[PDB]
Amino acid sequence: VKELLEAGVHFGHERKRWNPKFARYIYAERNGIHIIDLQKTMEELERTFRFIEDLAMRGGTILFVGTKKQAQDIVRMEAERAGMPYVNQRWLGGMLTNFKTISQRVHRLEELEALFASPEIEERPKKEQVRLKHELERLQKYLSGFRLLKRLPDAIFVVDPTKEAIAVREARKLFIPVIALADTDSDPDLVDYIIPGNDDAIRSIQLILSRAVDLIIQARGGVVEPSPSYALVQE
RNA sequence: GGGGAGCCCUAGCACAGGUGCUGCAUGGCCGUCGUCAGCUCGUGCCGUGAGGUGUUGGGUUAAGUCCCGCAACGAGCGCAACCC
């Protein structure tokens, strides 16, 4: 499944902007791109997906992060299929040191959902209502998937290794094992259980996250059908 | 017949009183900076630390009012706003 479908439509990318460690898990650099050695790909696939199966049988919280449009679409629906919080929006620097900040916004969000369905409609002048609508769409858009993150999330899949090494940075400081994906440019060793690949290829990520959902379901149950991407994959 | 209390007269004994100097000795109180929009703190990062960040970019507003990136998310005097 993996190696076959993988090579068939995806592997490496970027243009000699690479990272050292990358090169060791990689064959070639040829033409202008670094070519994913699918072997050890599948090796750490074994490590990581072992983890996945295990604590999917137990139950935990990991991210679907793609602050970039690409991944974004896919992961969002993946969340609305897997169950955990996701960060498609700009992951903000604060959560993993300022849990209380977010939790303030969050309890307040409970109260916001509350006062939405309330006789406070006609009351409190029109423009004011407009303002409250605006804060609504704020916390709504950003805290799209992530809204049900109660407790601490124990590992954090996520894509592109740079910005999402800012994400890595927070998780990493608060002693949290990183699962995550990377292309050519940035480093994987700040991650314990990495994933090399093409964070510019759409089919790659889709296959990965979709069958990873079906990995939690390989430990959970209910195996249905893959909808995300496909149509949105090449248009 | 006297003394005394309110009370009046002179002299004295305690002292009031003065728009005389000091707004670089003050209060309050204004003049200005200029409706100019700045000035800020709660949780946490960055540097050994002082300290920074917040608030520095792009449109845009009567405004740091706001939108997009954002070690940042909240709040203060403002700014707004209920009175006329």
Side-chain angles (χ1 to χ4, degrees), chain A residues 132-145:
Chain A
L132 293 189
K133 305 172 184 180
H134 289 33
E135 193 190 43
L136 288 181
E137 264 278 72
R138 167 117 299 181
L139 279 307
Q140 249 55 226
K141 192 194 186 201
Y142 280 82
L143 315 184
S144 50

Side-chain angles (χ1 to χ4, degrees), chain A residues 82-137:
Chain A
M84 307 322 134
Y86 83 81
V87 167
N88 83 105
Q89 299 287 306
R90 303 100 261 193
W91 171 90
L92 313 164
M95 289 68 138
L96 299 323
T97 19
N98 303 312
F99 201 112
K100 310 163 187 55
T101 280
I102 274 70
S103 288
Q104 251 204 310
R105 305 245 42 80
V106 160
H107 257 69
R108 174 57 213 282
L109 229 51
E110 282 180 339
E111 327 307 315
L112 253 177
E113 264 195 334
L115 273 178
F116 183 20
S118 172
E120 301 274 54
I121 315 170
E122 175 189 42
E123 206 106 348
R124 290 184 181 266
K126 182 82 173 178
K127 60 206 97 171
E128 196 276 334
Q129 302 192 71
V130 178
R131 211 294 291 182
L132 293 189
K133 305 172 184 180
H134 289 33
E135 193 190 43
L136 288 181
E137 264 278 72

